[PDB]
Structure 1
Amino acid sequence: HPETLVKVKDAEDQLGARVGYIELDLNSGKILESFRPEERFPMMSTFKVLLCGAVLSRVDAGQEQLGRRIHYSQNDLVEYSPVTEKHLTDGMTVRELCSAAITMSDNTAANLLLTTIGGPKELTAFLHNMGDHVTRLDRYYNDERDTTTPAAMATTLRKLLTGELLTLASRQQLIDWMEADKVAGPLLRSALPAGWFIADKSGAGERGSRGIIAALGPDGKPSRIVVIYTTGSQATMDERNRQIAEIGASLIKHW
């Protein structure tokens, strides 16, 4: 709705930064509104959902199993490893490692999973082969690296969640893990009335990078995909969260 576009612009003005916005009908796949849909923004942690799609894909093909156990060491742990740092002796299963990467945004978990698929290059290869030639991951835990565009991301996410790529079990698993997200409380979730469904993944990078990707909708059921990125701002974390939240209040109001 245009008022939502207003809020995205307001947000650009108030942040002194670029803001990219996509609202997507989950059913038809068609764009309800957009703003800078073809500009590149850092994915930050939002890439972890695409990483687990890749993962689930291998599991559908039987090149991976969700119950397979990975052991690792202190060596492997990078900054912000809330779940992984607790399982150095018993290891983690692939599932768990997805759970950690999506629900808690565990960095070491993302890395381990990237190793299981053959690295950033293979994730990019996976996104390439599903029709997203735009998004690229280049690294483990105006630079084009590790970027997407709001359109590329919104569409790739819609293919992963409701498209022909994944089995039904795997689409339900991916959505489940997103639904269990514990580290995006102040973003879209803050705007959500009682009984709405939301399944998301947030991100936060230096320079002012903040973002979220989400499937949501009224009465327990997702009906749209929303993607919001912003980078360039010198604003605090909290003022970014607020601006994503306000954008979120608007799109709920005008649903």
Structure 2
Amino acid sequence: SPQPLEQIKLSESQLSGRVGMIEMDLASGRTLTAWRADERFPMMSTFKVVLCGAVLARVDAGDEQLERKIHYRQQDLVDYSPVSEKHLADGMTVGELCAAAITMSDNSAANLLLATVGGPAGLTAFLRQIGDNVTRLDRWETELNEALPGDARDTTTPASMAATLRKLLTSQRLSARSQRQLLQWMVDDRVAGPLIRSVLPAGWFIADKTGAGERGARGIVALLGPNNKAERIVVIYLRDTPASMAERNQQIAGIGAALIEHWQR
């Protein structure tokens, strides 16, 4: 029932937390609704869309191949690595690593990919190259999820993340094939059930990437729209709340539900 900004104010009051949100038209890039859009939030695993954007940019340039096999070792394995731990003996291709990082939030996969683009500094340089002067990655998995209050490391803003996603998915920067691949990985996200997908009406398109961190941090970036076609980018981040995971998920789903209910209002 409540309007999106009303729902956000209710959520902040109920969580004692801070929400950041942008709703952006995909075609035009116009900002339609905004809240705390210029405040920093930990990206958590949502950074992995940018990471695989950087990988695909290397593919387009002939400097990388999705079929290239990467072999790795126990030293490379960190927590939250279900796919990369399974494939320890045989390795994974670059494309398999991006699928695991995006669809399953596989943390070691993301670290292996980060090495290919010059680490957190290399990824931040890519962001600057595409005209994002705000978003920054500073640490590797799993430290980047620490979400210490006031820490600028490993943060974005809802405005910068929305613009960057639009750039990666629709601008001329990535090839048509690369844009389709990055979007496909997001369509195939497996860990986003409790968020916008839980309130998405029948017949709508969704492609998304989620993140979870310490100190209540939680987030989602998404493209969604009616008639099975993407229409808008929605970014929702939460930080600084002691609430449970169930509560955090329910609140993000509720903000998504308000955006959906008031889609044309």
| TM-score, scaled to structure 2 | 0.95
Which amino acid in the other structure matches residue 5 of structure 1? Answer: L
For the pair 1:167 / 2:175, whether they are aligned, the reply is yes
Which amino acid in the other structure matches residue 132 of structure 1? Answer: D
Measured in 2, the distance between the counterparts of 1:205 and 1:87 equals: 25
The CA RMSD over aligned residues, in Å, is 1.0
State the match for 1:180 in structure 2: 188
State the match for 1:227 in structure 2: 235
Which amino acid in the other structure matches residue 154 of structure 1? Answer: A
Measured in 2, the distance between the counterparts of 1:245 and 1:118 equals: 35
Which amino acid in the other structure matches residue 158 of structure 2? Answer: P
State the match for 1:210 in structure 2: 218
Q: After TM superposition, which residue ranges in structure 1, 4 or more long, deviate above 2 angstroms?
A: none
Measured in 2, the distance between the counterparts of 1:156 and 1:67 equals: 26
For the residue of structure 2 that corresponds to 1:211, the secondary structure is strand
Residue among 168, 190, 198 paired with 1:190: 198
State the match for 1:123 in structure 2: 123
Listed as ranges, the gaps of 5+ residues in structure 2 are: 142-149
For the residue of structure 2 that corresponds to 1:207, the secondary structure is coil
| TM-score, scaled to structure 1 | 0.99
How big is the shift at 1:219? 1.5
How many residues were matched structurally?
Answer: 255
How big is the shift at 1:73? 1.3
State the match for 2:147 in structure 1: none
Which amino acid in the other structure matches residue 62 of structure 1? Answer: G
Paired-residue identity, %: 68
State the match for 2:134 in structure 1: 134
Measured in 1, the distance between the counterparts of 2:179 and 2:249 equals: 28
For the pair 1:199 / 2:207, whether they are aligned, the reply is yes
How big is the shift at 1:9? 1.0
State the match for 2:258 in structure 1: 250
Q: Tell whether the 8 Å contact from 2:2 to 2:258 is kept in structure 1 after alignment.
A: no
Which amino acid in the other structure matches residue 54 of structure 2? Answer: A
Question: C-alpha deviations, 1:37-91, integer Å up to 9, x for none?
Answer: 1000000100000000000000000110000000111221100101001111211
Question: C-alpha deviations, 1:158-206, integer Å up to 9, x for none?
Answer: 1111111100000000000000000110000001011111100010111
For the residue of structure 1 that corresponds to 2:82, the secondary structure is coil
Measured in 1, the distance between the counterparts of 2:170 and 2:179 equals: 7
Residue among 152, 155, 164 paired with 1:147: 155
Measured in 2, the distance between the counterparts of 1:155 and 1:2 equals: 26
Measured in 2, the distance between the counterparts of 1:148 and 1:163 equals: 20
Listed as ranges, the matches of 1:72-87 within 5 Å are 72-87=72-87
For the residue of structure 2 that corresponds to 1:233, the secondary structure is coil
State the match for 2:41 in structure 1: 41
Measured in 1, the distance between the counterparts of 2:220 and 2:171 equals: 20
Listed as ranges, the matches of 1:99-114 within 5 Å are 99-114=99-114
How big is the shift at 1:2? 8.1
